[PDB]
Design a protein around this ligand. Sequence first.
Ligand SMILES: CCCCCCNC(=O)Oc1ccc(C[C@@H]2CN(Cc3cncn3C)c3ccc(C#N)cc3CN2S(=O)(=O)c2ccc(OC)cc2)cc1
Ligand SMILES: CC(C)=CCC/C(C)=C/CC/C(C)=C/COP(=O)(O)OP(=O)(O)O
Ligand SMILES: [Zn+2]
Lengths: 405, 318
Amino acid sequence: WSEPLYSLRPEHARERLQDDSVETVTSIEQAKVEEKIQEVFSSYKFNHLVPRLVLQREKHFHYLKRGLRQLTDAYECLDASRPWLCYWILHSLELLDEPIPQIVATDVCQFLELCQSPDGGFGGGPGQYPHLAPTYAAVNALCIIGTEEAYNVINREKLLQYLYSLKQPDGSFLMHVGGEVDVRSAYCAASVASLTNIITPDLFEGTAEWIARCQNWEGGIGGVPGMEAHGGYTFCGLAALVILKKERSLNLKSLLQWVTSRQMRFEGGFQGRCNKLVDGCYSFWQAGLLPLLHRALHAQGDPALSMSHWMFHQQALQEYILMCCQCPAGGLLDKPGKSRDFYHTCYCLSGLSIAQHFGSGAMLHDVVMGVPENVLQPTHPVYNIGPDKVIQATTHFLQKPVPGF
Amino acid sequence: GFLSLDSPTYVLYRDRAEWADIDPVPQNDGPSPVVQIIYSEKFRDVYDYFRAVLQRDERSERAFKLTRDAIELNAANYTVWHFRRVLLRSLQKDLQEEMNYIIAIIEEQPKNYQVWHHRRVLVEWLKDPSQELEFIADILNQDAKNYHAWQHRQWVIQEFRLWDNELQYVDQLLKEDVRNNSVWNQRHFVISNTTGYSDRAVLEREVQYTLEMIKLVPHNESAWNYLKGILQDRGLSRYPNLLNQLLDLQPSHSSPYLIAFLVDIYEDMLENQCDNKEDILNKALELCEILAKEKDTIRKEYWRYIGRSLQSKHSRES
Ligand SMILES: CCCCCCNC(=O)Oc1ccc(C[C@@H]2CN(Cc3cncn3C)c3ccc(C#N)cc3CN2S(=O)(=O)c2ccc(OC)cc2)cc1
Ligand SMILES: CC(C)=CCC/C(C)=C/CC/C(C)=C/COP(=O)(O)OP(=O)(O)O
Ligand SMILES: [Zn+2]
């Protein structure tokens, strides 16, 4: 009689868009997606079968194992982002509990070595100039591997010089020399600096306050001061402030009201901005804010915080990802009718994990929709690598002094 | 002087006589590559020659034309854009001609960062914003929510102090799509950098416009966020007519957004020690649980937290 799946319940039909008989581009586009998603939800009834949600682990594994080695010319557009592809693919395998052969581990290491610039940082491929984005990916990939060889690839002295060469007077960082600033650049710098123990007392002077200038009237964070609030930039902003221990710079209440409002009542997934469309990659960028806010608000003694669940619909997000974001041939995607890619595979899986695992001190509590085999390894909400990979990396680099001390 | 990449008579660089003096530089991926992209012949050929001119630092007209093709094949390659800028300066290239180029490429690939940054560098070299607002308005007419387009517009308006006609643009677009959250954000950007909201004539005008938009489209969340946005850091309870006016909308214009705004009003009242705590407090909880259980269950965990934080600090307690 009862329906275990929230999206399939009779009541759920009431969550459809009310357009008040005023049609605009944005309402027409939202209605189209909801029509498509409703077909997906309904297909069990129409075909007269019992629903069972399974994460197609074997299909995803084959897709990733192969991509780690070879990519079609569809990825020409990502030829300046090869360290990103290493990170997205390696993180997806770590989430699926698939070990990395020592062989491929060493081949990734040697490839990333080739991407490293003599003046510090990593570029998008061999011989390319350095940029903060591929620097982040490269450092994260190397930490996922987590061997001594991997740690030893990184030139910490040059890395620090490189970060200084990008730091601006107003607190901000350029993405690369001759590039411009972004909230993302602050996160990339803080992520890489904190993991490899190279944070000097003045490196991030002004940075918390520059980030705080990016929070707007909406509650969320834009890419630069004055710009609309967006999930990817909000993730980067809050996570950078967590690393700097400056979360308090933000209005956390307006921030919480903002993210939580970004979950779609019908689809169950998240949108990136208000009045735009659901997309699977925001499973991570938006939902990953919730574990960061929880820990923030707990550190101020908020006694009203749940001890079993994050402040989003964990079940509805899982249902979106599992029913709407899997490609049957393997890999994951933005929404039904889009093409699979390694980026969405990474962030859809990261989002699924977040949704499955609550943790607040001694309190641990899982929610696993569908078959119990669907459980993933946990991910650290700041760095989006395994929490074990974070401890271990931070410990190893704490053995050395901040250059030069 | 150019041979287009989609020309039926396009020829690979390795088959061009003008390039015979130079040896291409194949990509070094090592003896056992990872994430190895199986490039098309055309892509590999352009990039083998780009590597050669980059490594020799050849600052020539032929190198400049080659950056064009390299960019067209991967417009995210920031190394090629940097070299192209070095070449524009060394060759003393005409920067209006290069402006004409970047306009065409942005039109084709409007969601690329490198392309907008390049335009910015050109505008700052030339000290000339005169084409910008009209150009951007053309991109926004195709996608009114393009993030890079809105950001370039803000930068332009800020650096060259071009505020005078922007609120009018905002009004035009809000009429085209009143749910466009980028336009609501641009409204706030203009007002807060011109007259400000710490006024009456302006403010009252803003609250009135919004309540009027809310009435036309009660489930448009953008207007609701704007209303809250322009009132909230003063304290919602500073405006005592607002409660009653919202309650008057409910029986004909109800939404989870209206009820949620009611709860924000009650919370500020409670924080500023209004008249009649338990009265106000209980109204709020009633609402919280209506949203959690019935009207906004996707947020059940948030609304149960709000119900909880409230009780925790505005009950009868000492
Ligand atoms: C390692 C060198 C990197 C050089 C800079 C890369 N940029 C960066 O680090 O900052 C970022 C800025 C934006 C992104 C997100 C985009 C998002 N997209 C497009 C997208 C995602 N969801 C909906 N959409 C439309 C995608 C899409 C697919 C893939 C894959 N695989 C990767 C991205 C990552 N980037 S993107 O700008 O590099 C990009 C945009 C459009 C594309 O066409 C499909 C491909 C990539 C990621 C990083
Ligand atoms: C660490 C790092 C560099 C992270 C990346 C952060 C990130 C996700 C940035 C997004 C930038 C952007 C222009 C989004 C708009 O996309 P859109 O309009 O195509 O999609 P949308 O409509 O859903 O916003
Ligand atoms: Zn996406």
